[model samples]
Target chain A: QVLARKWRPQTFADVVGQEHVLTALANGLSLGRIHHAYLFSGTRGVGKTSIARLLAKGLNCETGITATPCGVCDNCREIEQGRFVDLIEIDAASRTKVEDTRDLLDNVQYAPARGRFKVYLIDEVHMLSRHSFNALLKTLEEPPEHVKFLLATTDPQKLPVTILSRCLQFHLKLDVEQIRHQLEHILNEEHIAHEPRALQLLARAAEGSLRDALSLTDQAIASGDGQVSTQAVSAMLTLDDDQALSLVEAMVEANGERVMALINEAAARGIEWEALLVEMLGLLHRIAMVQLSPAALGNDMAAIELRMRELARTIPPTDIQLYYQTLLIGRKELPYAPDRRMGVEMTLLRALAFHPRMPLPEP
Target chain B: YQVLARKWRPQTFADVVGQEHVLTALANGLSLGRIHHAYLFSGTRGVGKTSIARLLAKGLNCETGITATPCGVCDNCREIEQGRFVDLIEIDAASRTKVEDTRDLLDNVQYAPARGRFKVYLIDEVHMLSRHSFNALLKTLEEPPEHVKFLLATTDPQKLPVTILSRCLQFHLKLDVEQIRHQLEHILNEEHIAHEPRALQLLARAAEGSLRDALSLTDQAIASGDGQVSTQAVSAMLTLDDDQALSLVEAMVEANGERVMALINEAAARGIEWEALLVEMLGLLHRIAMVQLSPAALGNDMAAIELRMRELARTIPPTDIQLYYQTLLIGRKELPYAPDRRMGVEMTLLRALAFHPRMPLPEP
Candidate 1:
């Protein structure tokens, strides 16, 4: 709460990573052409709810509606704190039961706020049960002119197509670099020191979900103490996933045994079997792709390829390809294991154990 | 830091833990004619049962693991792990346990081994197979020549019928903390990840013997650590400190009467965020007192000894320690629900005050 609260944006300019959404929103209201219903959707940790609230504040501005609402105003504060009578927020997850849906929309029957209109933010709308979505059909179809609906869902598909068709839709994209910058700004204000790679890794983990980025950032701040280290996080991850990581390590002193041992060690330690698998598969695939063509991976990957091309070359293409497939197949079988640890060990061993001895495993 | 499980998923058989018995068994089976038509592998998650199934398929049909040594440098081996190999069909029985899916899957069973030695059908969560589905699968399970090897995994074996369970060679995967911990420590050392022993213990406890869960938790821990896992970092991440537990321990050790007050004041200053404090401290107390009297009772929870050494230094007479420590540890359990945290804390302190007069208990 200390930094997450202090550095949170009170204005549109400070809100990062959603320029596409912000521009459309800022343009519509600024041009005095606001839409009747706007739906913001994305995964958890992304800024769907935050943007919706911001929109509510912007529309209810004392001065003519603008994307940039004055932070000092009572209306903005009320909206920010979710206390605005005109700005109503509901957890679609809880209200998914038909009666609760009915009870909530029951008040759509009431008058608009003293200012201009009522903003109903139904969050996690996908959680709404089928019966509730049916119950919500009428109000969503045609609410009063003074009412504006902002529905948000992590999963848009589950929301009936009829419901989806009724509202203006925005599918959020998770951009790691963008979210990294957004978090960088927030962390900078808080004076929390962090490595750029650490941020990138977190952003990648967050997978375009700004809220998830923030959540990870928040977790990172606590982990970093006052400052974070890239190497330390790297060590913490300690995965022998990619032949690239191993090959890179092996090329260090021609220690293939060390590299192999490192991989075995990782399996023994209990790393998330899927993550390790993904990292290895991704690394191997990237190396293969880059070898096939220069522009196959990201800057970091490209940098590794450039610095370690010889090491990458030393890796037999067939080996890289084999490891990649092995890791990928191993990932699919992870969830069903009654015990994932043993499953991972078996899976990893099977990859190494079954390879050289057999003829093309069933096509 | 990030536990090893999340860090190292399996790439080949070499990456699996424990169950070396079954691995040696399978590799040998592949080398010899010991392989059966349907092989059932039953074990816990994070253990390598299904790995055996995949390995069996790979061993049976690998393009390259063929040098008797099973080389990892082959297209088929890579393809198998990628889940792109065409002939090997791995199905999850949990969701596909209905007779229709089983029969539909079995319909293709008659087809020749599309790519490898035997058209391998690997079914996961095999216990999820409905009785009818198992009945449907019985014939295919019993009579699929050298082409098919069935690998089935389950945590609960009794749930499977005697007829199906009896048809295949069963393997049981055991959970071992020491072996797992040793593997974890070795991996961390190799990764050069700096982690406090306490952090590992906390993670191991949270893992509850499932190395995969432990590894995933370790990932969270590693993620939480900036670059290194310091003791303070893990404690804060885990939220294991409380006001009264520390204060009571401090007071019990100092016993100068004023040490208790100083301890309380220090906690107040530090904002002793209490979540797992009492339980953790109580655990500490139970062990130290138990260990002092009967060391055999101290099976694990080694961190408590370090903590005990740091403060108490075993200075208190052995006679009265257990009674006081037990009183403090057990008393704090009810503090949270005590209607008021301040009151809740005060009541524990009061109990400690009553016990403080005689902390060093006699041997249990």
Candidate 2:
């Protein structure tokens, strides 16, 4: 559904936002201080697999063991296209037993057909059984010197201690700023024009994963007819500004009737109630940011800032924090709500009721 | 098989810490037999919110009678602890949010307890309940059968609708670093897990005031440390140097540049990451602020550090401390961008020195 393949980083330098992991790997590749085994861990789409593949390319690239691989070479091209004979890429999400583990061990035994090293990249390695892990510990502890095992997982916590202690591990972190900057670069290189706000929305929605950012970008482009505009991205992300402002104003003014009416309108519009709450949450978040640093408001967000600046003053910072916490809780609770509409309704009403008119009671 | 978090969860009201206000009010309510139909417990993860909810259930349904000190040996107390009690229905609101399921839960709510005086329904993570679920339970939540009581627990009580909030008494749980430390030490001693006091301090701080998280980390620590939790083992396991972090601040306050450099060198020598050292300083500054507010804020295990903090508080002007804290925070943010993290830290220290408001003016 998305062009994760097209935008996927082909080389270490091409990779975005994992400077920590990339830094260490670049040094190792440049210094020829490659470890026999490596483990990469982080949340989903945070490039655990991407880094694994990149490392595999590094080990087998025909230009020699180098950080910057020559993409024109057969080994680099083959690894990138997933056709390399020596590079074994396994989707280890299946229930891997000792028999399969034995095969993996045997696979490590054979020498590289062409490249300097036989690279084994196992993704979602956490899915392997304890028996499989025990089997892996044997190979990892004393792996074939020519073999490079790149084990990647979203959960390194579940990995066996023996396996964990055997490999040099690098943990990747998500930074929204870096993710957005990278997304902007991809958009520009492709000759697409987009609002900075759209990129920010996509970046945040992507959490910390550049893969998710691109996926959303691809989706936004498709929906917006090849242009990622603010309106298009907002529509894709279910951010209706009017509805958000209406909800927040109700909370501020303590208008019980107006709050219920807005909920009624939201349901009638066929809006995803959970998303509406989330949208309000996003808007409320912006209002708080404007409250925290009024000067930082962007030119694109001038209209929003003017409106939210007034709204922020109407509600105190503590109340904003309080309401923000409540809305997040409500958003979480929405799925569990028997009906989504009623869930958001109660969530909004709850926000209205708890708006601290007087000083909060002392603990 | 028994995790420390579960094994050491508080079973009685008196055992609960950092919630004196909630307990006092509840104790009064219990003695007066003026128990509210519903009670809500709210706090961050690892706090005693869940444990206190369970304890409240025990208090209300104890076969020995409705009293704060439920006889732990009683069938009611034992069943509740073992999660085999018939009267105490613990529901995870995270699951079972279908329209019919919620409807049925209310229908079941009407039935009296099979073995106890009160039918206590303990719904955890109640914030996870859907809007429809809250609406469905509105009538029952507001005016449940006199024989029934609702106890709700959530890390995010803000999510619950205003209607639901108004129907129950809400108890906001506070995380106390001191109380958590005291509890961990006592539990460690009782479990016969030989532990360095410093290791326990790490666990307490690591928990960030959650007794549950502390105990869980304690289990991991014990397992990794071969039954003996030493400072070295814990520091290695958690990758922290509490003493070094404490000493850095102490040295900083004394304006001892040589000692500061030596501490930084010692950290580098041990291969302790500079980023973590910066983070440790940030955490120390936070605690020092707490110490400025009150001595009890630092708690017992940290009394030695508390004395030192007290000394720093006396010598350093409050505004200077704030400026240093702000400077350290900004320095921490700039750490990842710095060319050399060690040098970045050194410069941060230098900046703190330069910015110290109380530093005597240089002779022109």
Candidate 3:
């Protein structure tokens, strides 16, 4: 019972960051004019399964088909607890064969035992083989009226057009700010003391996946001794701010020697080469933003913000773009390097190598 | 040739596919007898960086001695080409990054060549060296022994310390798609294989300026078609479906919502990566914008999409086109943050449709 499942959203109202999906779904349930099949295409940890289960509960709640389910109903409670027979959760990835589809299609014809709809929830639906897809096409086209299919996949690109055509597809969206807000709420509920900065770090690392955010929060909490601190998070992620700043300062000075020295120091400390690069990139992004518009600085300013502002002001906008592009290219080229440390060193040197030669006149 | 890249390795500066800039500089330096102690070759993979380094090594160690044109029959020239030359020591920095290891290599730089006039060190993928190793190499590279020459190659030259960079002369390689395509055509003709120029051009652009990449793809196409290359065979082999990208833009300009949705479903059916689809769409949008600005500016080799692009240019208002382009740029920027890239692309397409001045917004 990790935080991913422990804090799973239980109802449509509980879900966050996918209003577009829930809007259409809630409307369908309220009007009692649901589509025969629904497809949820998105990366994992964005609540595809959570929303599916919520919809399943909505359709079969004993109070009747409603957008808001009566949790007290036998059908609703069973669905919530994963005990309802009418709500069949199939992991297509495990049984990916034409034979499995043939078995599933037969069961698709059955009427609901205790609910208004027999919902077939298929996870990793992309795992269905070409033959399995063919076997599924006919039944999917015209399943029993009471049967509803909810197919979810991290990779919708793998599904056949024939299968996609039969379903009303909804693409899930991840809102980072919303996810961060949710974390704050979760931390409060769990009575875990935390820093907003620590939560922001987790949110950025989550890359928009709520489940990843919670999982990271779990790690951060344990490492911080039940208190989430920015220092603990940064240490865990291996993002060294002092070294990153020095590297930037050296780049401005065009001192290639000092840059390598800092990199060597970081490598000695076992700082993750990619994580260091990512921090430098994040810093660059902020500096570039500040250069373009001071109003863009929306808080979370570290002590180095003043120095970054000064650097941004002195470095021409074109140089900023050049540095940004070089860093990005180096990051991509990192994976192909013999080792990541080499990647980090090379990327930094490239920024200095391509540094704008014609310096602006000082005031 | 055991492998296309290996068999086609450039033996002379002139045999290299592109980088006339680097070649002219090197040749001029060699003829003028003013060659630098250190030379840096930088570019993406398969762009002839390593090939050029080996060629430089040959130029230095050839029996003809330090001339751009090495005599192929000479012992030094043949040995370097065959990677058996003792004077031309090739160090793969990837496998030898320890500072201690680098110090030993640096100490060896002090010795004179056993046979050749100058000792040539060709460090391939030099960026893979450890920071400590880089520091060690820096001491020697800063003021190398007169008879020692360092030829360094890396797809990522940016990683090298500035101290090392300042000590050497740097050459940046540009990926010229047209040049790579022509080179592929020339090779095909030499191999006595029949090929369509259009098919060769497709492989060239797909290769993204890496002659090695172009040759590898050419090899793939030749194998797929039994030594014959055709546009259809190459397109099928690549599973590129460029037609769908065109249909998407055409559908959007025509305000055909149903057709747009159908095209998306079709793309999903083919298992197309949504980001690639967005990129293709962005390419089309860019081409259309160019056509509106200057019809003559559009490349003639875009045989399939030029007419559709011109049609789009004529029908869509310039303002609307610019708006769609901006929307697409922002959408692509926001793509990674989406629940998934598929939804991001969908939203981008829907944004284009929604803002089409004459078209109705697409239904959810």
Candidate 4:
């Protein structure tokens, strides 16, 4: 099984980050103040579906409606297995027409077949057509006594305000630190050896989605032969910060030929042009910060910091800012260029061509 | 009595500006009696898709029989021009986007033409139709009746399904600023409106390839200039400076911060918008870069702006121009987030100057 699904948070306690959302949901479940409709709005892989399913278990668990579900009970196990008769999971993207919505809601008025509440969890609910949304409005605003609506979408802006106003909306945000800690816990539990730095790289690459972090770790484990290492993760992520530093060093020397040489070297290594440019931009930003104050060089690898400090001492702050600006714009223009290699070469050459000349010595 | 855009709407294939590629093929198709069952006209707004569609409808049903040069005075041509042609059905697909509406519209497709040789269905903004509506359209579009012609127009043709696109002959209309300018000059001359050549140039460029927008802007310029177009009037109307952008760029290139500040102050005194000023400067920098990189590609207009751009192209290093362009391009985005408008403009320009290639580092 894929790590994302196999290690899916089975209960509220297993879910990471989004403490505000989890706290609100748990309090509501404990106090029996659950709303009929809940809208989980956030980017993908942030546990919107998982949390909704956990709430479904809470509603159906034999232990009665509570914040925590008994995983051993028939209700919870069936919900986990995605075969609970009362829990209807609809992917709103495919069945987006009004007829589909009407047919689904026709069953909404009927009583739950097995559980206390019939949970209608609609994912990507934003893809529904305008008329479909309207067809859902009456039921969404006031569902039956034994019915609950859970809608999740990456973009809430596409949803009509009428639907938005009728539901209790909770936006689940991604946290890198939360993802990193979870990876560490999961890796240790799975008896897979891993490095903290590797987990850190994976978490950062995930950009807030814990599922993404787990999937990345899964890939990292296979690529590293059942062990995770920072080097392996970096290669998987194409994070060649050292090569990016070399490019910056070339820019500092104001050598166009050397810049082209390093670019070709990076290209030969199959480094993505945008990734290389992004790394260079990031390195330049750090150097600029370091030039401003040594304390501003926060928490990067010591080796990376040492090279950044060297570039900081060698290049002026304004020139550093210039290179940062140039690369930032070049990154945007890269996709428009006829070829990626030419784009990288032109961007680097632009930085070199615009390098601040050295002041003449006194005669 | 009508506005210039509607007043001068193209009535024949020859009257349309700058779509000779589509026009030539369409004209040849009509003359040879090899007309397709369906044609898709795709382009950005105001690029003559709808106008060409109407002309094709007239070309197919002209009283003189199928011909490229339709007699505009004939009953069929005059009726289509007046938007009362019985055989031509114009649908604003944006308004009627449901499957039922499409079904109802296509229900009459099998019937014979009421007044003309063929029934033409001109569906404007065809991309706005719902998915089901598109599915319904595909059935009719796949094997349209022998007497029906479907001319589809859309600004966003990519939204259309490949099945629908495959059933039609696609022609993408391009916006050409040069063609727009020549047309504007021709209209101004024919109308006997007193106008400066520079004013027309500004209108042409400001149109950004949309001849309709160019004509509309020309109408506003004519009213603003009291039936006489001048460069100063058009510049003021467009919130553009005559030579302020060039002057500011020159000051920055020379490292004359004081002159840059003075120019900004003068612009502020004139109540010129800081964002517009930055946009103008970015455009001038782009032109200067073009001159430096590909002088042979630039048109030989030899206007004062062109001469100045050429001169600056030689004096300023290519790298410095790029730096300034990049700096201001980013700075423009930061303008709304800045402390204030003038300060934003001031800081962006000052930053460009401070980051000159030859500028030395300050002492610690």
TM-score of chain B of 3: 0.79
For model 1, residues A265-334, the per-residue Cα lDDT tens digits are 7656766656665555446545554443345456445446554465455555545445544555566666
Locate the minimum summed-lDDT window of 10 residues in model 4 chain A: A157-166
Identify the runs in model 1 with alpha carbons over 4 angstroms from their true place. A1-363, B1-7, B65-69, B96-100, B239-248, B251-275, B290-320, B324-364
Over A146-259, each residue of candidate 2 has an lDDT whose tens digit, in order, gives 788888888764453334444666666544556777888877777888888788778777866788888888888888877888888877775435777777887778887878
What docking grade applies to model 4?
incorrect
TM-score each candidate. 0.45, 0.52, 0.50, 0.50
Candidate 4 lDDT by residue in tens digits, A1-363: 557779877889977755546766776788786766777888887788999999999988889999899989989989998888999877866734545755776777888888899888889887653344555655643456898888999887555333554566666754344567788888888888787657767887886688788888888878877787887898788654478788888787877677888887777878778777766765665565455446646543565667777777877676666776677678767878999889988888888777677223375
CAPRI quality band, candidate 3 = incorrect
The regions of model 3 sitting more than 4 angstroms off are A95-107, A126-138, A157-162, A173-178, A188-191, A298-300, A357-363, B1-364
Model 1: TM-score for chain B: 0.74
**Worst ten in a row by lDDT for model 2 chain A:** A157-166
* Every model: Cα RMSD to truth: 29.1, 16.8, 21.6, 16.6
Model 4: DockQ score:
0.02
Interface quality of candidate 3 as DockQ: 0.01
Tell me which of candidates 1 and 2 scores higher on lDDT.
Answer: 2
Regions more than 4 Å wrong, model 4: A11-14, A17-20, A70-72, A94-104, A126-138, A154-162, A173-185, A188-191, A195-197, A204-207, A234-241, A289-300, A358-363, B1-127, B130-364
- Give the per-residue lDDT of model 2 (tens digit) for B1-364: 3446545556688877777898998888887888888898887755666577777778788877889788888878876665546776655565422224455667778776788888887776777766766665787876688899888888787787898899889898876666777888888888877887877777777767766567666755654455677776566544455667888887777665567767776665444556777887887777777777776677555665667767776677777778778878877765643323554576567555534465511211
